[PDB]
Amino acid sequence: AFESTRPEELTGFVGKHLIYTYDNGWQYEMYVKNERTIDYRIHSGMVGGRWVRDQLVHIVRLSDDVYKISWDEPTGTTVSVAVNLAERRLHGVIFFPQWIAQDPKKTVCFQNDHLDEMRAYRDAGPTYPKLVIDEFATITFMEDCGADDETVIACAPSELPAGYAARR
Amino acid sequence: AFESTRPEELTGFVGKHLIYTYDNGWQYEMYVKNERTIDYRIHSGMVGGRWVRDQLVHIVRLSDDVYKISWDEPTGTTVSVAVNLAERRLHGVIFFPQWIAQDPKKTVCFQNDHLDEMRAYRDAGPTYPKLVIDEFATITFMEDCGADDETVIACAPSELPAGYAARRN
């Protein structure tokens, strides 16, 4: 299932830590913690406040500058993000189950402490139709944190020093 | 909902007609019929024989050479493909509902005439866990057909001329 994960091709991407704003104004943050894991933190928008550690992902190199990260969430949401490092442009597609569209705050938590809850909501549904969000984003801040730094994304967006998400 | 669709960014991509084989051996064919539509045709693998016309998609430029196409299916499957035109490689992530993993032939049809059926199977489930296929592919044949050519994908894969899907460039 992770056959396509090729660490040797990902050395320019693993370790990246990006803050970005989608064209709809939602502000997101992702840390590429290793070849198969991300942490992420949502700052604003429909699910602002939600954050997630140790999400297993599929990370591939598309070109020298472009990388893709795709994953399935315990809520039922599926995601594929691409990043163009050179252009500092991200694109995401997010397929939300209908239950999230109807009541998105249900997912606004530190997910890792609410896994059973998320699975229950997922299982109760409804699932369909999906709310599909497909948007470009500007990468406003990007840094290289190296792999397996557990401090990059370790608290809620409300617990960060002033101006954190507004940098660059 | 199609705000990300930017025709000026897609002029090198619209009209492309690709035949490709995933690293697991499954052979797929896609036609980028316009800025928001594909037709596709599966030749082999878990759902070989399936074909689809007029699938609404989100097509975006990632670079000069790399484009992305993403979409939701009436089966519950969600898809995102990226094509690297220069390297003649494709990458797909496909998130199949569990019901498809268990009985994939249920989806082998001209889907456009079986929308209610696909949605029924989708609604009955199971949905979870998803069977996630994340795989590279080699693009074996690529040509420019221009937009809105209704003849490119207009029959089942069984009805094509003998070596059609094996042609290369």
Author numbering:
A (entry chain A): 24 to 191
B (entry chain D): 24 to 192
Which of the paper's sentences describe this entry?
PADs adopt the lipocalin fold, and the core of the protein is formed by two mutually perpendicular β-sheets. In solution, a homodimer is formed by two monomers that are related by an improper 2-fold axis. In this study, we used ancestral sequence reconstruction to generate thermostable decarboxylases.
To gain a better understanding based on their activity and stability, we determined the structures of N31, N55, and N134 via X-ray crystallography. The models for the remaining ancestors were predicted using AlphaFold 2.41 N31, N55, and N134 were crystallized with one, two, and three homodimers in the asymmetric unit at a resolution of 3.1, 1.6, and 2.5 Å, respectively. Also, the overall structures of the PADs were found to be conserved, leading to an RMSD below 1 Å if aligned to BsPAD. The C-terminal part (depicted in red) shows some structural and sequential diversity. N55 and N134 harbor an N-terminal loop (depicted in blue) absent in N31 and BsPAD that contributes to some extent to the dimerization (compare also Figure S4). All ancestors showed a highly conserved active site architecture with identical catalytic machinery. The residues corresponding to N132 and T41 in N55 originate from these helices. Both were found to form a hydrogen bond to the NH1 atom of the catalytically active arginine in all crystal structures.
